[PDB]
Amino acid sequence: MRQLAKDINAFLNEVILQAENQHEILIGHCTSEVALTNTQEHILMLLSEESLTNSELARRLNVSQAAVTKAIKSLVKEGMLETSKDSKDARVIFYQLTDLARPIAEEHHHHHEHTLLTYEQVATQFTPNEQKVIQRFLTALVGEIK
Amino acid sequence: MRQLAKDINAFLNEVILQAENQHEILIGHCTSEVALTNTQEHILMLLSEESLTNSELARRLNVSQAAVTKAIKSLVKEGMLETFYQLTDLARPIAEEHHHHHEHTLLTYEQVATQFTPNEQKVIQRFLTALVGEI
Numbered sequence: 001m002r003q004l005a006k007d008i009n010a011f012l013n014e015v016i017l018q019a020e021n022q023h024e025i026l027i028g029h030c031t032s033e034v035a036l037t038n039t040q041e042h043i044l045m046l047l048s049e050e051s052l053t054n055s056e057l058a059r060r061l062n063v064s065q066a067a068v069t070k071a072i073k074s075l076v077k078e079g080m081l082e083t084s085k086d087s088k089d090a091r092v093i094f095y096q097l098t099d100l101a102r103p104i105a106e107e108h109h110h111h112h113e114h115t116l117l118t119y120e121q122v123a124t125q126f127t128p129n130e131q132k133v134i135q136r137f138l139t140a141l142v143g144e145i146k
Numbered sequence: 147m148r149q150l151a152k153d154i155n156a157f158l159n160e161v162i163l164q165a166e167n168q169h170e171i172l173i174g175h176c177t178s179e180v181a182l183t184n185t186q187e188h189i190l191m192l193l194s195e196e197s198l199t200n201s202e203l204a205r206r207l208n209v210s211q212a213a214v215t216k217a218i219k220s221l222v223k224e225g226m227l228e229t230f231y232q233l234t235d236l237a238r239p240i241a242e243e244h245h246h247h248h249e250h251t252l253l254t255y256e257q258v259a260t261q262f263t264p265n266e267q268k269v270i271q272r273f274l275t276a277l278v279g280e281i
């Protein structure tokens with residue numbers, strides 16, 4: 001058996017461990033001045049863009065409506081979200097960010113960018129030809145996992 | 147930005163999705179005729195090998211002691227474990243199935259690796275190590 005087979009198993013183990021039960025991996029520490037859960041921040045990021053329903057948020061976040069419901073209630077309660085109505089949105093009423101939430105959504109967005117840039121750093125340690133090999137590997141691996 | 151950077155992010159999300167709550171990914175269906183969580187099966191597998199404290203199990207799976215303990219209490223309630231904790235006869239085929247599932251998983255990764263040359267495999271190895279190093 002090739003060493004790589006064992007490396008793949010250990011790698012997947014490490015990924016899951018690093019995910020810390022969150023629905024996503026982000027590189028480095030959150031820098032927000034208000035401590036919201038990762039899921040809460042991600043919601044603020046998404047809603048800073050799309051005015052989604054709690055049901056649509058749950059599908060994207062891959063969680064239960066209940067969890068989203070709890071997240072939203074907390075966000076409304078903590079003054080991160082408020083109800084609103086305006087000509088730019090078809091919805092009769094939706095949750096939009098308050099001024100307090102703006103920097104949070106922005107920070108979480110920056111955190112996603114930093115995460116992608118980190119993978120960019122990793123990718124560029126390899127030649128374009130080598131990157132292609134790594135691409136083929138991820139495709140074959142993900143094909144067996146799903 | 148290199149597309150590979152985005153592919154990496156997409157891949158990690160898929161792994162996390164596939165590992166729903168579990169501490170590990172396994173390939174294919176669990177063929178146990180019993181509806182235990184993956185963590186429960188894994189704990190049975192380990193205890194089928196040797197007696198371990200809940201603290202030790204937690205270090206083995208890299209999960210909280212709370213996670214291990216809850217799994218154990220359920221296993222006891224389902225008649226899989228008894229007082230260290232030791233397997234009952236009901237649990238034995240399950241621990242065996244979970245071990246076979248692991249073997250099948252490694253064999254699948256072997257099949258993946260052998261789609262690449264020895265030199266290509268090294269590249270992929272360096273990649274895995276570099277990626278984890280940054281996480």
Ligand SMILES: [Zn+2]
Nearest residue numbers: 030031032108
């Ligand atoms: Zn943050």
Ligand SMILES: [Zn+2]
Nearest residue numbers: 024042108112
């Ligand atoms: Zn996020």
Ligand SMILES: [Zn+2]
Nearest residue numbers: 176177178244
């Ligand atoms: Zn199983």
Ligand SMILES: [Zn+2]
Nearest residue numbers: 170188244248
């Ligand atoms: Zn296992």
